Amino acid sequence: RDWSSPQQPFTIYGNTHYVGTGGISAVLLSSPQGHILVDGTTEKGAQVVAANIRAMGFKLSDVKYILSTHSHEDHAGGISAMQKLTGATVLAGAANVDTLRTGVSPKSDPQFGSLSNFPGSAKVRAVADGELVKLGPLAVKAHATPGHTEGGITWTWQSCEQGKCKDVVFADSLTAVSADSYRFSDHPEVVASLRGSFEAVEKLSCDIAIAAHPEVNDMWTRQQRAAKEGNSAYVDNGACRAIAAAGRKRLETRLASEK
Ligand SMILES: O=S(=O)(O)CCS
Ligand code: NA
Ligand code: NA
Ligand code: NA
Ligand code: NA
Ligand code: NA
Ligand code: NA
Ligand SMILES: [Zn+2]
Ligand SMILES: [Zn+2]
């Protein structure tokens, strides 16, 4: 379950499908009008994402938007390739837009250096905090969740299965992790952002959470159980609270270990 490993795709809930790798989340939100893909995984994972979308019985040319959580290589490395395969527009938080266009992080990024560069993407533009991305029946809201990077966006929508509608959250990473030489102790505004983000996330309406790192909300456990109990296995409305709490506890640990 490394970041580029093949993973048989599956429906999470209604028109929300998992089409990511074994280690990195990507989600296809489908409609008879076209689809929104969230994240591209790694540069080598892109070929997994593309194969997974086709295996779910969709066409790459029907993907009209690609949404980015944040611009690290493990989530965004595959986006240029996916953009080229789909023709999509790529949406991202203002502060990550340039990284996606060039594939080069800013030196403000906790993992500048620590992760390599990756292919730059065409057809990127910024979303605003609060902005609604629309496509036919689909409506996805951007929520600014900076800190892990400056332009992090957590994305939300509603999916309905057999008349039962749930609030889905694709949770950007809330983790105080970095290059070995980067210190969160030396970047108080990054720390403050993170703290703001914990709070934003734990307030979200959150029936189904998909974490950018899928095991952060137990994806593989839930998915095995979905065989037995159906897609209720993914539903758990404390999930966003737990992700935020984990982030918060991780930050406190990190700051201490630094000093
Ligand atoms: O989680 S890792 O810091 O290993 C990858 C970047 S989000
Ligand atoms: Na696969
Ligand atoms: Na399925
Ligand atoms: Na399933
Ligand atoms: Na973003
Ligand atoms: Na959940
Ligand atoms: Na069910
Ligand atoms: Zn990251
Ligand atoms: Zn990551």
CATH number at residue 97: 3.60.15.10
Residue of 175, 180, 250, 251 best suited for mutating to test ligand 1, as the one with most atoms within 8 Å of CB: 175
Total Cβ atoms within 10 A of residue 249: 11
Q: Please, what is the angle between helix 188-203 and helix 239-258, to 10°?
A: 160
The per-residue b/e assignment along 102-115, b for 16 or more CB within 10 angstroms, e otherwise, is bbbbeeebbbbebb
Number of structural domains in the chain: 1
With beta carbons less than 8 A apart as the criterion, state whether 108 and 95 touch: no
- Closest by CA to 72, choosing from 213, 249, 170, 242, is 213
- Closest by CA to 103, choosing from 93, 115, 90, 118, is 118
With beta carbons less than 8 A apart as the criterion, state whether 124 and 76 touch: no
Sheet-wide strand order for 164-171: 132-135, 138-144, 153-161, 164-171, 208-211
* Phi, then psi, of 13 in degrees rounded to 5: -165, 115
Cα–Cα dist 83/163, whole Å: 33
Residue of 177, 184, 215 best suited for mutating to test ligand 1, as the one with most atoms within 8 Å of CB: 177
Instruction: Give the structural domain span for 9.
Output: 1-259
Cα–Cα dist 160/166, whole Å: 6
Q: Which residues are documented as binding site?
A: 70, 72, 74-75, 148, 213
Using a 6 Å cutoff on CB, does residue 70 contact ligand 1? no
With beta carbons less than 8 A apart as the criterion, state whether 54 and 64 touch: no
User: Could you give the residue ranges of the DSSP H alpha helices within the chain?
Assistant: 46-55, 73-76, 79-86, 97-102, 188-203, 219-229, 239-258
Cα–Cα dist 171/231, whole Å: 19
Using a 6 Å cutoff on CB, does residue 72 contact ligand 1? yes
Ligand positioned closest to the Cα atom of 177: 1
With beta carbons less than 8 A apart as the criterion, state whether 58 and 91 touch: no
What distances in angstroms separate CA 103 from CA 42, 77, 119, 123, one per listed residue? 12, 8, 5, 13
- Closest by CA to 223, choosing from 20, 81, 38, 5, is 20
Token pair of 23 as six digits = 């280690």
Cα–Cα dist 236/209, whole Å: 8
Cα–Cα dist 229/49, whole Å: 26
- Strand, helix or coil for residue 257: helix
